[PDB]
Amino acid sequence: IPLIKELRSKGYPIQFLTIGAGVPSLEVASEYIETLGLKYLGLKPGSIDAISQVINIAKAHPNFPIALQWTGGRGGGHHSFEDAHTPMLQMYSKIRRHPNIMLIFGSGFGSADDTYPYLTGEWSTKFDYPPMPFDGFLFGSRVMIAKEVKTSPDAKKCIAACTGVPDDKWEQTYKKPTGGIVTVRSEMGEPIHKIATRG
Amino acid sequence: STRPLTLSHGSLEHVLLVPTASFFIASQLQEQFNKILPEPTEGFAADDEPTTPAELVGKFLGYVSSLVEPSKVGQFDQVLNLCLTEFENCYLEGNDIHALAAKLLQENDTTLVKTKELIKNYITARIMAKRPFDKKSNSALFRAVGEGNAQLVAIFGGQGNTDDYFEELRDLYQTYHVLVGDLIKFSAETLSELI
Amino acid sequence: GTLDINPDDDYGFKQEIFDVTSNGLKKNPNWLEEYHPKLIKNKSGKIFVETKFSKLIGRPPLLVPG
Amino acid sequence: AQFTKVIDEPIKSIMDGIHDGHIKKLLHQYYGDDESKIPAVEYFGGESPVDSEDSAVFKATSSTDEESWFKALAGSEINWRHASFLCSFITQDKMFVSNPIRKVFKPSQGMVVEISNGNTSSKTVVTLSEPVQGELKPTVILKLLKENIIQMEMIENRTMDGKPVSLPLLYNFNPDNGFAPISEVMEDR
Numbered sequence: 001i002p003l004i005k006e007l008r009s010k011g012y013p014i015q016f017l018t019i020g021a022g023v024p025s026l027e028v029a030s031e032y033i034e035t036l037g038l039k040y041l042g043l044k045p046g047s048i049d050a051i052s053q054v055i056n057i058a059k060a061h062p063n064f065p066i067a068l069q070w071t072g073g074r075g076g077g078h079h080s081f082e083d084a085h086t087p088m089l090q091m092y093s094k095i096r097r098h099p100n101i102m103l104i105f106g107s108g109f110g111s112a113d114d115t116y117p118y119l120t121g122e123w124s125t126k127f128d129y130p131p132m133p134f135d136g137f138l139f140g141s142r143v144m145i146a147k148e149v150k151t152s153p154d155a156k157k158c159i160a161a162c163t164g165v166p167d168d169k170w171e172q173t174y175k176k177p178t179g180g181i182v183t184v185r186s187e188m189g190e191p192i193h194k195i196a197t198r199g
Numbered sequence: 200s201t202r203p204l205t206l207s208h209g210s211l212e213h214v215l216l217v218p219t220a221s222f223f224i225a226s227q228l229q230e231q232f233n234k235i236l237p238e239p240t241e242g243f244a245a246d247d248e249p250t251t252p253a254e255l256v257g258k259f260l261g262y263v264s265s266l267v268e269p270s271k272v273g274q275f276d277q278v279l280n281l282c283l284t285e286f287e288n289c290y291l292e293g294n295d296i297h298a299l300a301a302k303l304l305q306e307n308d309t310t311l312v313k314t315k316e317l318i319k320n321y322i323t324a325r326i327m328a329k330r331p332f333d334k335k336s337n338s339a340l341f342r343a344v345g346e347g348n349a350q351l352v353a354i355f356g357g358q359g360n361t362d363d364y365f366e367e368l369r370d371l372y373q374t375y376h377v378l379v380g381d382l383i384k385f386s387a388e389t390l391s392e393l394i
Numbered sequence: 395g396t397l398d399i400n401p402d403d404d405y406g407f408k409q410e411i412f413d414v415t416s417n418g419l420k421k422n423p424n425w426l427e428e429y430h431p432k433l434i435k436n437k438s439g440k441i442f443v444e445t446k447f448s449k450l451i452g453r454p455p456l457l458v459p460g
Numbered sequence: 461a462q463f464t465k466v467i468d469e470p471i472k473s474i475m476d477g478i479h480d481g482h483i484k485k486l487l488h489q490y491y492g493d494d495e496s497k498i499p500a501v502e503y504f505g506g507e508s509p510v511d512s513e514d515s516a517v518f519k520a521t522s523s524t525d526e527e528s529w530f531k532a533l534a535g536s537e538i539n540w541r542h543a544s545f546l547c548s549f550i551t552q553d554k555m556f557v558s559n560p561i562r563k564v565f566k567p568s569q570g571m572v573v574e575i576s577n578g579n580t581s582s583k584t585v586v587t588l589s590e591p592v593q594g595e596l597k598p599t600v601i602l603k604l605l606k607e608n609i610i611q612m613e614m615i616e617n618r619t620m621d622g623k624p625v626s627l628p629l630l631y632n633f634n635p636d637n638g639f640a641p642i643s644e645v646m647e648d649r
């Protein structure tokens with residue numbers, strides 16, 4: 001945080017800061033927003049409670065842009081236990097009561113085709129809700145075999161060969177290899193989606 | 200010529216530009232009024248204690264209305280009409296009583312019950328002063344459905360919305376008596392007969 | 395039925411009926427219309443997907459996350 | 461993982477893949493496959509998610525609201541002038557500094573701004589005049605020079621021989637960068 005402030009004050013081209021693995025308190029957010037000359041703040045709430053915390057941060061700085069990066073348990077790396085859809089169905093209305101929240105959808109996305117119904121808002125139709133269009137998207141896993149990522153040649157081969165699974169089967173990672181992915185506990189006990197290598 | 204008449208309760212007042220003619224009668228009501236107000240407190244917290252200048256003029260309209268006769272015309276009629284005219288200018292600004300009542304709720308520290316009293320006092324005052332709501336309303340919603348930028352459907356609730364439904368009737372009869380009294384009375388008589 | 399104040403402004407109370415200013419005519423958002431994705435052109439003729447996000451950053455509304 | 465197959469695809473291709481795919485679908489679904497129906501703006505970006513006349517004079521009191529004042533000097537049409545007065549920062553060669561145009565035009569008692577040729581941006585000239593030893597004089601002249609060079613002429617009317625003196629500050633205006641379209645010409649500055 002002090003680094004960003006120092007660098008930002010020498011006019012470094014840092015546009016924004018995204019905070020991962022849970023959402024700051026109002027007092028800490030208020031600090032990041034007002035001290036670090038940032039043009040927006042990214043927050044990655046994992047649960048319905050976390051989304052409320054993001055809203056209360058936006059409420060408190062209603063002219064400051066918040067990138068609310070919504071993410072499912074179906075996400076890669078450190079992941080939640082949450083469905084990708086239910087939390088957005090519950091909270092979308094409350095999020096859109098705050099113009100300064102730029103609502104971004106992440107996790108399980110790879111192409112224009114799978115991502116488009118979330119841009120249109122036609123996705124929420126399937127669940128007898130009105131259309132709920134999203135402002136943006138993030139691609140984590142999809143990008144890991146790009147030419148210019150440092151992922152080792154054999155690692156890209158291994159990622160590629162992962163057939164992957166539809167959203168309705170993603171939770172089987174808790175029990176067994178599913179699309180060539182398992183979930184697995186960190187040293188602190190948080191779940192992680194990793195490729196089901198021997199190791 | 201005019202001549203001032205301070206309506207007051209603790210901190211807050213309203214300077215009333217009473218015509219020279221009607222000052223005799225007006226300052227009589229002023230005096231009899233000031234005693235029936237309770238003692239001021241901090242914040243004006245007591246239930247029957249006006250928190251704003253608007254509420255104050257409210258209570259006065261309500262008092263003066265109670266001394267006005269519906270068939271004959273007494274001496275308090277020319278006073279009531281000037282208090283209304285003064286209230287409508289200073290506090291309504293051509294808007295509806297309900298719009299003012301909602302300002303006082305968010306803006307000041309008046310309670311619901313003090314606001315329902317304000318609405319009662321102003322509407323009771325309008326009818327007793329022979330100034331009914333004959334004019335068609337400047338309602339922004341109704342103008343808009345008028346121009347076809349809006350359309351209304353009316354829905355009517357059923358049983359089971361609250362455990363204390365009859366209080367909603369009390370509130371109507373107490374607040375909006377001058378508007379709804381005839382309807383309640385008819386409904387009661389109709390049901391007695393049905394039995 | 396009731397006079398009261400909705401802090402969320404979700405819906406209105408009796409005031410909204412009789413109010414004469416803008417405050418009488420409030421419309422609830424239709425999300426489809428309010429957040430409809432759009433297309434837009436720079437002077438160079440580049441096409442962007444216009445959303446609340448891309449409108450800020452002047453780039454496609456797509457990001458590689460940390 | 462079900463969408464991750466093609467190894468060593470350049471990142472530009474993956475991302476443009478997704479964006480181009482959306483444009484294609486949006487064009488068909490809402491624009492009748494017709495690129496001429498897509499609205500255009502000189503530059504795209506710099507829009508907070510919360511948010512004329514050809515010849516005008518603006519007088520700054522001590523009450524004038526900054527936001528109204530800059531919105532006025534900017535004009536509605538999106539051009540070099542809109543950026544000059546609303547864009548919060550400018551580039552000085554990779555580094556981002558506070559927009560010096562907004563700094564110099566921050567409103568206060570005495571300031572008078574005159575816009576000539578408001579409705580044609582190629583020719584527009586905004587002229588700041590302030591009190592200088594009693595008599596009101598021009599202190600700043602903002603305009604295009606060439607098509608993509610903004611010039612803020614900073615004027616000192618208190619000089620060695622009475623003849624006013626000029627500092628020509630020069631800024632490139634590049635509408636291909638919607639987020640940071642104005643960047644100071646640093647060479648020989």
Ligand SMILES: Cc1cc2nc3c(=O)[nH]c(=O)nc-3n(C[C@H](O)[C@H](O)[C@H](O)COP(=O)(O)O)c2cc1C
Nearest residue numbers: 020071075076077106107108109139140141459460
């Ligand atoms: C290898 C890897 C590393 C990650 N590292 C971080 C990190 O440092 N901080 C963070 O907030 N999220 C991290 N994430 C989560 C991503 O930001 C993002 O939420 C997720 O990858 C999106 O889901 P998807 O990968 O299914 O598209 C990581 C994800 C992966 C796969």
Ligand code: NA
Nearest residue numbers: 159162461464
């Ligand atoms: Na894969």
